[PDB]
Homo-oligomer: 483 residues x 3
Amino acid sequence: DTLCIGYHANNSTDTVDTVLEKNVTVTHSVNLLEDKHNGKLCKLRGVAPLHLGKCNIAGWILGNPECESLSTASSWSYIVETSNSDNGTCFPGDFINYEELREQLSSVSSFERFEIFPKTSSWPNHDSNKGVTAACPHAGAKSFYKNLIWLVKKGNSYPKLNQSYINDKGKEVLVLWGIHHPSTTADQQSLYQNADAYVFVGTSRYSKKFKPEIATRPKVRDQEGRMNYYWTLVEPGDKITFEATGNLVVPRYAFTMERNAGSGIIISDTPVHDCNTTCQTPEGAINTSLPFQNIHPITIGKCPKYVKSTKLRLATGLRNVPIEGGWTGMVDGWYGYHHQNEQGSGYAADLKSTQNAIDKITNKVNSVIEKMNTQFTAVGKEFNHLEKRIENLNKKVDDGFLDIWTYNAELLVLLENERTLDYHDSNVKNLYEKVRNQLKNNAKEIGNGCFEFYHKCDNTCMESVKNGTYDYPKYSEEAKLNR
Amino acid sequence: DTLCIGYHANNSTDTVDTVLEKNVTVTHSVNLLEDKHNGKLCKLRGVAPLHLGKCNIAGWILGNPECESLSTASSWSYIVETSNSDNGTCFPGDFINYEELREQLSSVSSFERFEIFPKTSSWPNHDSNKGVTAACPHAGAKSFYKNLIWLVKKGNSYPKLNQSYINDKGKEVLVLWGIHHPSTTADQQSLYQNADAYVFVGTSRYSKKFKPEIATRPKVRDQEGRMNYYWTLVEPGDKITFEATGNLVVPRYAFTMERNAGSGIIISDTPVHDCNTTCQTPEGAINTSLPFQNIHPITIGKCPKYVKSTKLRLATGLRNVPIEGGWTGMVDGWYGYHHQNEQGSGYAADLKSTQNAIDKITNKVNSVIEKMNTQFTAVGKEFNHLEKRIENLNKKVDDGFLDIWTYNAELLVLLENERTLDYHDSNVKNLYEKVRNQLKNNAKEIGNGCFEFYHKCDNTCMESVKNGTYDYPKYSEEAKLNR
Amino acid sequence: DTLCIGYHANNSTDTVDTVLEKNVTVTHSVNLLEDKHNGKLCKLRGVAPLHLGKCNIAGWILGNPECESLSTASSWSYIVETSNSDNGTCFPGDFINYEELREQLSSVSSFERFEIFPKTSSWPNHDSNKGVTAACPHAGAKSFYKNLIWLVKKGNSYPKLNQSYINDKGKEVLVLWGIHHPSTTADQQSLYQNADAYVFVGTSRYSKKFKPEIATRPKVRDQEGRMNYYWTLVEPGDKITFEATGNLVVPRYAFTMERNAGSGIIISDTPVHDCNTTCQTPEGAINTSLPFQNIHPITIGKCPKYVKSTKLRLATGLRNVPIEGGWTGMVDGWYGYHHQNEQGSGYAADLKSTQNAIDKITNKVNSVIEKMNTQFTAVGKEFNHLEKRIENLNKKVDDGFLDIWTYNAELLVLLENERTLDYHDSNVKNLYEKVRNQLKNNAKEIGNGCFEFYHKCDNTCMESVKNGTYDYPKYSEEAKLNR
Ligand SMILES: *[C@@H]1O[C@H](CO)[C@@H](O[C@@H]2O[C@H](CO)[C@@H](O)[C@H](O)[C@H]2NC(C)=O)[C@H](O)[C@H]1NC(C)=O
Ligand SMILES: *[C@@H]1O[C@H](CO)[C@@H](O[C@@H]2O[C@H](CO)[C@@H](O)[C@H](O)[C@H]2NC(C)=O)[C@H](O)[C@H]1NC(C)=O
Ligand SMILES: *[C@@H]1O[C@H](CO)[C@@H](O[C@@H]2O[C@H](CO)[C@@H](O)[C@H](O)[C@H]2NC(C)=O)[C@H](O)[C@H]1NC(C)=O
Ligand SMILES: *[C@@H]1O[C@H](CO)[C@@H](O[C@@H]2O[C@H](CO)[C@@H](O)[C@H](O)[C@H]2NC(C)=O)[C@H](O)[C@H]1NC(C)=O
Ligand SMILES: *[C@@H]1O[C@H](CO)[C@@H](O[C@@H]2O[C@H](CO)[C@@H](O)[C@H](O)[C@H]2NC(C)=O)[C@H](O)[C@H]1NC(C)=O
Ligand SMILES: *[C@@H]1O[C@H](CO)[C@@H](O[C@@H]2O[C@H](CO)[C@@H](O)[C@H](O)[C@H]2NC(C)=O)[C@H](O)[C@H]1NC(C)=O
Ligand SMILES: *[C@@H]1O[C@H](CO)[C@@H](O)[C@H](O)[C@H]1NC(C)=O
Ligand SMILES: *[C@@H]1O[C@H](CO)[C@@H](O)[C@H](O)[C@H]1NC(C)=O
Ligand SMILES: *[C@@H]1O[C@H](CO)[C@@H](O)[C@H](O)[C@H]1NC(C)=O
Ligand SMILES: *[C@@H]1O[C@H](CO)[C@@H](O)[C@H](O)[C@H]1NC(C)=O
Ligand SMILES: *[C@@H]1O[C@H](CO)[C@@H](O)[C@H](O)[C@H]1NC(C)=O
Ligand SMILES: *[C@@H]1O[C@H](CO)[C@@H](O)[C@H](O)[C@H]1NC(C)=O
Ligand SMILES: *[C@@H]1O[C@H](CO)[C@@H](O)[C@H](O)[C@H]1NC(C)=O
Ligand SMILES: *[C@@H]1O[C@H](CO)[C@@H](O)[C@H](O)[C@H]1NC(C)=O
Ligand SMILES: *[C@@H]1O[C@H](CO)[C@@H](O)[C@H](O)[C@H]1NC(C)=O
Ligand SMILES: *[C@@H]1O[C@H](CO)[C@@H](O)[C@H](O)[C@H]1NC(C)=O
Ligand SMILES: *[C@@H]1O[C@H](CO)[C@@H](O)[C@H](O)[C@H]1NC(C)=O
Ligand SMILES: *[C@@H]1O[C@H](CO)[C@@H](O)[C@H](O)[C@H]1NC(C)=O
């Protein structure tokens, strides 16, 4: 009659690496690294993105003629631009603090367009119907930005323009305007009469005077002149004043909006779908609770940390090795016993030891995952061609964090997997000793983690040994007789 | 007669977490996380902060009428502003490179105010007594900044102003001035006569021409005009030249100062007290050598790393479990023996093993703490409303470091605590074996980590076993007789 | 007859630290920290640096008279400036976006100088031979920048200047020019006639008007006036237009170049040598595959992480302690046996166990090193005196990463070294047990990890025990007789 202590085995072919040994096949493991996405752009915090299918942000906020088709949302959690979103400014010039605006508009709680300076009543002394150009065509017709009015001299006169808006909203108002810069003096006079024109704009924390910069420039979109764009936020209760003798492109519409924390802009040709996520990647939303991902470095949301590793498999089970080896027949648990006597034979798991190991290892896996506790962040940032130093500083931060997370994540798995297997080996060894301590002189050790009895051990005996209730004295005399 | 190997126990109710098991009660532990402060703002490097109780930095450096009460320090290690420090610029306008100045003044080795352009001798052709406004009242009277002079036309004439200062100090000089921008032409003429006025200021590495920007603006502090503020540092040996035909607010006082490395600004209503610290937090100074703190993300000094964890308890002792369990009576050490014979009974610690474990664990704790080796840094940074991209870059850095430190700190405690307990278990087991190896056949194992002798073992025997000097052969014959 | 299980020892005197115990002497260890360099500046990616021995970048790109001796490379991987590279701008003024230019030129795939506006044909109406100054002397003669032409009125007339360049290159063109600012009106007229002069420059994404700012300034290099420098890149297919009535210093030469990713600038007096490296440090190139270095925080290339630790020794071997202690005579392996009988005595390594431990530990060391997987980065960044906030942000990033890497690197070695020694102890103990399991009752344990036989064990017996093929029953009767 024999009783053996062994461990579980199966047909599992996946592996883990350990710091000491590579390609260790295990019976069970979990994945800490998410390498998949659903291929769709989803809502964040239950709120849809603003999708600019053809237009970029400058185009959309200014009212490029091609953005008219776009339905504006009252709110959004992030902005999506496509790889071919070319419809930005249609009248060539510099959009000032464009990048800062792009970021401020990245996430809004609310957004309403309203007509700040009504076309039919605000500009009675100026011609608001000649403000068109071939650079901003609509269905082949000369046109202009929808949210701006380009005023032209009326009756060969451009009287001082003096208008203001008082922000009676409970929210900040975004006001945009522009300055026109004719290619020649002749154009300056044709449009504004005054020649030596100036523009002044200001609010309680903003004040700037502008002058026309008249020179011939290389043609862009068939324009030898330029039009710059400016913007400011007006605090609730404040006033914005526009004073000009020419070259001012006045706001028509302005936006009442409340900035929501902050998010980012995703550039992707990936479609928007009615789905929910907590982590939005340019390649598609990520749906996981795992601490790491290797899909993309730039994500918006409470995202897993980006690592450049390809495989972070955390062992939970023991080595799968078909004690000489494991028992593929012991399907009911990790550790257990096999017995053979004159009544019968077979396998049975040691439920106390097995469940103990399961609870401790499961909690261990949960510790690694639960402690990541990520924060909601935009990650991606945008800089212009004269901001390379800061762009590269941002890169240092992303590369530094990547190397830290990759190094620590890859080692952590390697530090954990080695012991996990030693832990299981220890538990198996401990079962062997627990039996040895009971059998004492009533059985001999025969190798392979097995004991051979010096007495007949029936089913009620094998159970006594497994349950830790074996009566040594009871079988002592028989054992003496057989030695 | 018996001899048992056991371990210490007490009435301690605190716990540690391990990566495998939560809420493990231990006999001894240490705290790696500082969650308290003394509630006071203290000196850094033995040097007091500059406390601006009512004024902010712009107010203080310009000489806002309400800062007159403030006693200026000759030096400071950091600057403290209160939550209601509203007295900044009193004459509305833009303070240029204000944020850069705020940071440069954050820490100074020395700071002296001196009268760079004496009021009674530097401006003989201009009226220095009319430079007042209702926007900067003093005790109800019209007044102005104390460190600046606003010059007005004298006798309906504003002759070219031409003054310079040569820096004969061994330290850099901070010179501040401003440009006035009247709301109307009529005011420009009332104050400066010339109408088409200009201002020029320059040093060896600085040169800028300014022109009045005259337009009506929204009233701020009852002013329809604005006054901008500018500043520059003058290197030792250099000269600063002020040339103007109007609209120049000239320096009266300038500051000779030496910038000390760099620190930061704390915004807090917490009072300044005569105390010392090496880490200043907005909520109160931190007094600890521990590697982590969870008090606040923004601190100045050689501060513990901020983590968002709440509990980093590092086990030093063994499991406190009242071998079946621990011995609450073994008060003299972690590991030890209990004996009982016909002479007496009781507990005694194994001093060699216990001290060994103490030295190794104590050194281990010190390793975790000592290796943090922090640096002196300001941490907090300030950006304006047109600098959101860089402000958010700074945020990424702080959030990234927080997640890294929190994740690693929480795991480190969990990686350490699990083994610390296994280490103690190993030492206890080793004592059991050391005894087993001596007693051999002269005693039997009876469970609970205890041996039962087959011979009479007197006090001089029990000591021989504990001391590793047990004479097996000596008691062999008696043991044979009793088997 | 005896057989002992022991371990290797030698005369090695180096140590490792462990988290539990300091100064542990080991038989073998490796260094993870590189603290040496070859003292020379080497090529990166097979490409030489651009070495500016006397000139700085502004000097070199503008053509300071002292840079004429310098041979320009067609390409470079990084730029080297010396500690005394004072020859920058020779005509005092502000070089605009200088820092951004310095970084863009840090690494170029190709770089060709060409004469964008030929001196003899582009400026027929202006005097190109009077553009000299005492501020930019050459061999004692008045001179000027080599890549720029300072045009002066010809025949007391300065007719409108109108020239343009079309970029017919497949690469970006860097065009530099400057604006002159005379100290007095009299000089403005002496040089340009027009007095109220202006300069306009523009490209498809750039447009700026400049005006002379005429005022007397402190003398720098005997100049009471100033000359500012501007630059822009012209995209392939675009045009740059220069329109002026005076005060324009026109480009003579321009550079056709392609920016290569990005690198940095090293300031060092260390010479350039014909050698190769993958990591360039200001103190000399680093030649190692190790994960960490403590040479310098600022490096260019696929560099080891900078740590401020001094010693990262990773144990590979076992404790070197001349089982009571190690065997200095067992030179053929880490673990092994010693035997003595009537035939002979001596040592022999256990090759199976020793090689197993070597392969696992060697792979372990390689795991720590191989997983660092660094990226190519410049690390160093440059900011001006009005950019302290961003400079200090960059510092936070470097200090934060340093503390993270130092803390983790120092602990990692301490976490690893402790167990490495326990691992070896476990393997030695396991050999002891493997022997014990065979000998059973045919030998006694005598301490020191040794067994003493109860029978005569010849050379063919000692080999049977070591090889795991000992026949217990064979010697059982003799063992009985001797007990
Ligand atoms: C909107 O974007 C399209 C491009 O997506 C612009 O059309 C291009 O205009 C340039 C200049 O006339 C032509 O050289 C290209 O061949 C046109 N491309 C296509 C596909 O038609 C269009 O002009 C933009 N409209 C506005 C108002 O900005
Ligand atoms: C995304 O999450 C939001 C909750 O934040 C879901 O909104 C709920 O939708 C159900 C209808 O299915 C309504 O009865 C609930 O009242 C809504 N909750 C709130 C707070 O408004 C939304 O449906 C989810 N979207 C998807 C695609 O699953
Ligand atoms: C100093 O700060 C106080 C506020 O702390 C200023 O007083 C306020 O002035 C505004 C404008 O006149 C009033 O609407 C507020 O009601 C005043 N508040 C209080 C509490 O009096 C004061 O004018 C500032 N003085 C200077 C020189 O800047
Ligand atoms: C803060 O630390 C400084 C030392 O950096 C203490 O200054 C010393 O004060 C004693 C009087 O108690 C003098 O006798 C010493 O000469 C001072 N040392 C130096 C270098 O000047 C200071 O007292 C400490 N402050 C507090 C509140 O403890
Ligand atoms: C090139 O750099 C040298 C310094 O390395 C300049 O020479 C200095 O010029 C100043 C001003 O005339 C003198 O006060 C110094 O004494 C000179 N130093 C030396 C060592 O001669 C030189 O003028 C620069 N040349 C150019 C074209 O920039
Ligand atoms: C630095 O590395 C480059 C390769 O990137 C070496 O260039 C080779 O030099 C040999 C002559 O010794 C030529 O036969 C090969 O054709 C070159 N390879 C290439 C791709 O051009 C260079 O010699 C190395 N420099 C040093 C000092 O070792
Ligand atoms: C082989 O592996 C698969 C997947 O785990 C499992 O469903 C199947 O039952 C295994 N076959 C055997 C004989 O265990
Ligand atoms: C197996 O181990 C070897 C190293 O001996 C390694 O190169 C290989 O990639 C591992 N196997 C896989 C991915 O199957
Ligand atoms: C995938 O998304 C669904 C719906 O929100 C969620 O129930 C499921 O748990 C997510 N999968 C994972 C791995 O989190
Ligand atoms: C196992 O042992 C426990 C005592 O610890 C006893 O109560 C239980 O009945 C035993 N199980 C069996 C099947 O006898
Ligand atoms: C209970 O715990 C306290 C605090 O450690 C200690 O002072 C006291 O002596 C303990 N009581 C007993 C009976 O051990
Ligand atoms: C005890 O463990 C449970 C998990 O089983 C955990 O939720 C709880 O917070 C722990 N206890 C405390 C703080 O007392
Ligand atoms: C608290 O401050 C005092 C005085 O400087 C110092 O002696 C004490 O050690 C500090 N406490 C800690 C935990 O460092
Ligand atoms: C303990 O053993 C040492 C020898 O290692 C001996 O010198 C010492 O006297 C012994 N202690 C007692 C109390 O006998
Ligand atoms: C002493 O150490 C050196 C360096 O490792 C070695 O070459 C030499 O053989 C050693 N001497 C002895 C006797 O082992
Ligand atoms: C040896 O250990 C001590 C601590 O007990 C430490 O101070 C010393 O620096 C270590 N030794 C060296 C560098 O030899
Ligand atoms: C030093 O450089 C040489 C030549 O490139 C290389 O063969 C050698 O392996 C390098 N040394 C180290 C430690 O990498
Ligand atoms: C060692 O044992 C193996 C069997 O595992 C056997 O084949 C080999 O011949 C033995 N070595 C010697 C020297 O007998």
